[PDB]
Design a binder for these strands. Structure first.
Lengths: 88, 183, 37, 112, 88, 117, 220, 100
RNA sequence: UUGACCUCGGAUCAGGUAGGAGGACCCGCUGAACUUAAGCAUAUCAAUAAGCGGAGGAAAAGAAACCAACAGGGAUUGCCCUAGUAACGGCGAGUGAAGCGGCAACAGCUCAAAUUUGAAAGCUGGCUUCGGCCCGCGUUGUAAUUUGGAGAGGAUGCUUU
RNA sequence: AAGCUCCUUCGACGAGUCGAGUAGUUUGGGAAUGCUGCUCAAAAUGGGAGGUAAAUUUCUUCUAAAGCUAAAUACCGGCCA
């Protein structure tokens, strides 16, 4: 038994797509984000992770939609930053 | 030639006249006993084709058998279970053959032809006196009827290699170490 | 009330079923026999 | 027998017009190769050189099609946000993975 | 292979061991008219009068099981509709 | 292949001379009942089927109905005078027919037939 | 408009895939693999071999398909692939060989089911006459037309056709994009590994006079 | 006559979903506001957000067409129509499968 | 009111039959695990053992919906080789036939589907001096003829009891 | 009573069976190797099984869903030797 990260396993094209695979070690990059209101929803997400899944289907769907609205807000800020970079 | 007409009508058994008869008979057979007796065959053309005659010593019995699985499947057919239940009831008679007569969602209905080996009309007739011999005791229990010959794979060809003489006899032949004198 | 024998009830219920169920014309023509004369 | 005229008259009965000036690449998505790929394979029994030749022929087809498809403007790259049916089920994609896990863990245990 | 002179043979009396007699065609046609139709055959009849030959043929495939049996049943039922209006 | 219980299904053949003398006494008892008659029946000359054995003939099961008719031997008398009949086999060639008809005429020449009662 | 093609000019193409009566599990898997890559086709099985080859024409007319891909098995061991255009178009016989399907775990590639292919052909496909009418048939059969409502939008696989000796070699690959160093492409193989030797070409739909014969075919 | 390659009224693939979604489980597109993509490649979004009081009333008294199934086309749960519910009843009872 | 025919029952009515034993061999149903792969689960063990049902001196199978591709063979069964071949498989362990050929022995038949219709010609009883009387079964079919490498019907002239 | 011969006369051949789909079991054998249950359910120059790239399924070979039948075969039991 060994860790999968240590094994050089190629990425497989499942129902979840591979996207564009980045080379390992050679110019591997990452991203950057802090936020104010979306990170407030990450607070709302983590007690929901800590206190477990909600037995109420209404409250579980309501808290998932709040994270969806946070992703929609975070995405709209990202295209706004892309438009600002195109203007500059 | 009334039985040629019956043969063509029995082929067409989902049609309106026959499905009506199969509906009203199934209601009647349901409220009778399981292993009750029939004075005359319900399908006289199938009884005739299978060996029934209007002679003293030939009787007809009707059996209801429960349908479904045993996902294990009972390798015995429902006809073979039907034939075994008449012989345990009419232990003095010999099971000649059987045929289908009716169907339901819970039961299947079969009619079984029995021959009395102790009547004098039977022993006098050389077309049916073979069943008087003691080798033919309880043919339905040994798989010797038409259902049993089917389920034992008693056909000829490359397709029936393992079961054309009996699988247990063939397995004994194929697993026997034959050692000769001057090896 | 009183209990009828089983075969008496079965042959009587075969009457009612024959007159209630609607019969295909192959069997329905047997319900029309000829007259006394 | 090779009735070369007969193949020609039969062909023009079937043919849909595939001209890059008149019909876009979105219609056919078919690319012929410059090389005939018989020159790439010296020996048929040579397995690795044979698969490399077929890889290389679809390599230029994948590159030449991508340039023609990006210009025309239809999408080419499947988004990370998109999920749909797959030609192999997820179960088939799993035991593909532990085929390479036991092959990777065998060579690490062999080194260890 | 080897050159042997061939013989003609007497006609097999097991040839066409079904029933091609003119009498057995009378029995089959008379029983059908007395018996009527199955419920599935009634649906194929109704589609054939309406003109939906393709739907009747596909329905016969799903019910009987093979395409050649679908051709046979639809041919027999189309000849029933033809002989029905001849009497009409 | 000693994977199963070979010990409980091993057959030895110490009765091979015992079966031989029993076999000879069965042939002896067969000619005791059929005293002037032979112990076997006439079988036709038949060509082996596959291309490996095309060039060798053997003894078959019985004579064709056409082979009995050409030799002048009746079909319902042939089993009673020691000739095997096979209705399944066909001639399909004149060489198979001529070889077996000649065999039946040779049997006819060597035959002594006795008159009923 | 019941074509289910939302497009400017329509490529109205339907195919019908059939396995005859003796197809093995290997042949049946290849028919299931090919039909998973054609959203414009429908499946059928158990076609009576004692029937006539032009009753295949009646079959596809009934099901409204203008192409047929017929799998004929001999002895339960030998696969013969038929391509035709159903009313009048030419017909090609093939002999399938060296079959490999998706259930083998060594393939390690995957593509969107029903997505539109990149058909890759050969130079020898373009010059030579009998292969050139064959290329018309594969383009019609393996086409996946433009506006087909069962076709996935994003295009991620290449269908490869090539000649080596006298045989057509069919390969399927997955388009995968990576980032370069300081997007370049690479293909990973998916499935239907099979070899098609052209047997004989008919002018008719499933009959008609005979146009191409291969005088190099050694039958199994 | 050339075959006109149209889809018949009885064909299995006569009407297709717009969402280009097959037998894929609908556990995906739960954390994502959208649901599926269409043939041209542009995006299909969830229609709306259900009310808490409406969901509470649905839990107390379920509708006639409720099945507990998430629609592959819309994020709202799929509800059977009146004609679909009548078709299920006629299939189950079997008294009149086909009208007129 | 009488008398059927059909169906269902009773009788310490007459005449019979089945149970249980044995089970070495035979026909079916049902059905393990230990072991092996120096661990082990697919597999194997094994279509075995234990359990149930059923026969005879043998049983079973059996007169092709056969094998074949040949110049064809010709019911079944068993021996010799085929052959550790074909075929299947954690392709490892392994599993594993058959046609042909040489022998042993050989044997073929009965129905249903036909109108005897110029004559139910068939059969069980129980009463007898026994030589032949009734009763019943049966036309919703008991005899004769016929069973597809056939056959029937007329004619025909020999040959058989 | 019977065998044949001839012919301006006839010749009936087995259905909830086959088959299509599915689940189980079994086999060297997913042309499903056989068998069983379940859903649907046939034909009459028909049906079954094979051969064949040979140009269309050409040809070969039998006739399932009724039945009987000695011998060659087996035998730690039975009557003996």
């Amino acid at each position: 038994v060994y860790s999968e990260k240590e094994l050089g396993i190629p990425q497989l094209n499942t129902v979840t797509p591979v996207g564009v695979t980045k080379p390992k070690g050679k110019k591997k990059g990452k991203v950057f984000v802090d936020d104010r209101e979306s990170m407030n929803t990450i607070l709302a997400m983590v007690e929901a992770e800590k206190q477990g899944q909600i037995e109420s289907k209404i409250m579980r769907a309501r808290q998932l939609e709040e994270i969806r609205e946070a992703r929609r807000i975070e995405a709209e800020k990202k295209e706004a930053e892309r438009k600002a970079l195109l203007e500059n | 030639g009334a039985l040629k007409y019956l043969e063509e009508l029995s082929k067409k058994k989902q049609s309106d006249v026959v499905r009506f008869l199969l509906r009203v008979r199934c209601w009647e057979y349901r409220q009778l006993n399981v292993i009750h007796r029939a004075s005359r065959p319900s399908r006289p053309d199938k009884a005739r084709r299978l060996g029934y005659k209007a002679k003293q010593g030939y009787v007809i019995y009707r059996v209801r058998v429960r349908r479904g699985g045993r996902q294990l499947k009972y390798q015995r057919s429902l006809r073979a279970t039907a034939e075994e239940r008449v012989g345990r009831r009419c232990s003095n008679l010999r099971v000649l053959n059987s045929y289908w007569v009716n169907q339901d969602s819970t039961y299947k209905y079969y009619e079984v032809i029995l021959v009395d080996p102790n009547h004098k009309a039977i022993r006098r007739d050389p077309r049916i006196n073979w069943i008087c011999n003691p080798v033919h005791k309880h043919r339905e229990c040994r798989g010797l009827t038409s259902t049993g010959k089917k389920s034992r794979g008693l056909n000829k060809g490359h397709r029936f290699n393992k079961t054309r003489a009996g699988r247990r006899k063939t397995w004994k032949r194929h697993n026997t170490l034959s050692l000769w004198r001057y090896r | 009330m009183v209990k009828w024998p089983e075969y008496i009830r079965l042959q009587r219920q075969k009457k009612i079923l024959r007159m209630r169920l609607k019969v295909p014309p192959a069997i329905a023509q047997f319900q029309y026999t000829l007259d006394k004369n | 027998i090779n009735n070369k005229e007969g193949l020609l008259t039969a062909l023009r009965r079937i043919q849909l017009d595939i001209n890059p000036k008149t019909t876009p690449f979105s219609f056919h998505q078919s690319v012929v190769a410059s090389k005939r790929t018989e020159d790439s394979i010296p020996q048929i029994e040579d397995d690795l050189q044979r698969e490399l030749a077929f890889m290389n022929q679809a390599l230029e087809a994948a590159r030449l099609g991508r340039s023609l498809l990006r210009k025309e403007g239809v999408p080419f790259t499947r988004p990370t946000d998109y999920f749909a049916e797959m030609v192999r089920t997820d179960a088939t994609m799993e035991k593909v993975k532990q085929k390479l896990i036991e092959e990777a863990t065998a060579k690490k245990a062999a080194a260890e | 292979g080897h050159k042997t002179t061939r013989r003609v043979l007497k006609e097999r009396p097991s040839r066409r061991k079904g029933a091609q007699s003119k009498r057995t065609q009378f029995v089959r046609s008379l029983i059908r008219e007395v018996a009527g139709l199955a419920p599935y055959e009634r649906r194929v009849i109704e589609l054939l009068r309406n003109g939906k030959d393709k739907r009747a043929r596909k329905f016969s495939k799903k019910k009987l099981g093979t395409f050649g049996r679908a051709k046979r049943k639809c041919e027999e039922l189309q000849r029933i509709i033809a002989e029905s209006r001849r009497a009409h | 292949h000693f994977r199963k219980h070979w010990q409980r299904r091993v057959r030895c053949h110490f009765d091979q001379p015992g079966k031989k003398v029993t076999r000879r006494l069965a042939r002896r008892a067969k000619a005791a009942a059929l005293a002037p008659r032979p112990v076997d029946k006439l079988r036709p000359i038949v060509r082996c089927p596959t291309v490996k054995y095309n060039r060798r003939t053997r003894l078959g099961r019985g004579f064709t109905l056409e082979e009995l008719k050409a030799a002048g031997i009746p079909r319902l008398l042939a089993p009673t005078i020691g000739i095997a009949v096979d209705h399944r086999r066909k001639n399909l060639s004149e060489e198979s027919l001529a070889a077996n008809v000649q065999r039946l005429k040779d049997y006819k020449a060597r035959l002594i037939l006795f008159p009923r009662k | 408009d019941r074509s289910n093609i939302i497009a400017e000019r329509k490529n109205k193409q339907r195919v019908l895939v059939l396995s005859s009566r003796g197809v093995t599990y290997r042949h049946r898997h290849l028919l299931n693999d090919l039909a998973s890559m054609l959203p414009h086709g429908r499946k059928d099985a158990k076609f009576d071999t004692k029937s006539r080859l032009y009753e295949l024409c009646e079959l596809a007319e009934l099901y409204n398909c203008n192409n047929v891909l017929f799998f004929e098995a001999r002895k339960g061991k030998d696969l013969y692939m038929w391509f035709s255009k159903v009313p009048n178009g030419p017909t090609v016989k093939f002999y399938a060989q060296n079959l490999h399907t998706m259930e083998e775990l060594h393939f390690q590639g995957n593509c969107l089911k029903g997505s539109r292919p990149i058909l890759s052909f050969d130079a020898a496909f373009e010059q030579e006459p009998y292969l050139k009418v064959i290329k018309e048939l594969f383009l019609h059969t393996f086409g996946v037309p433009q506006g087909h409502k069962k076709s996935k939008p994003f295009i991620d696989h290449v269908l490869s056709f090539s000649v080596a000796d006298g045989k057509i070699w069919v390969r399927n690959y997955e388009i995968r994009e990576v980032e370069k160093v300081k997007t370049d492409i690479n293909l990973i193989e998916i499935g239907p590994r099979f070899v098609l030797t052209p047997i004989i070409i008919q002018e008719g739909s499933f009959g008609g006079p005979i146009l191409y014969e291969n005088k190099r075919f050694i039958s199994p | 006559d050339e075959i006109d390659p149209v889809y018949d009224s009885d064909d299995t693939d006569y009407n297709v979903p717009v969402n280009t979604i097959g037998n894929i489980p609908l556990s995906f597109y739960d954390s994502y506001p959208h649901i599926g993509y269409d043939i041209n490649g542009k995006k299909i979004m969830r229609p709306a957000t259900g009310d808490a009081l409406q969901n509470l009333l649905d839990s107390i008294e379920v509708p006639e067409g409720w099945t507990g199934l998430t629609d592959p086309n819309t994020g709202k749960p799929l509800n059977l129509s009146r004609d679909e519910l009548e078709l299920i009843r006629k299939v189950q009872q079997g008294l009149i499968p086909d009208d007129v």
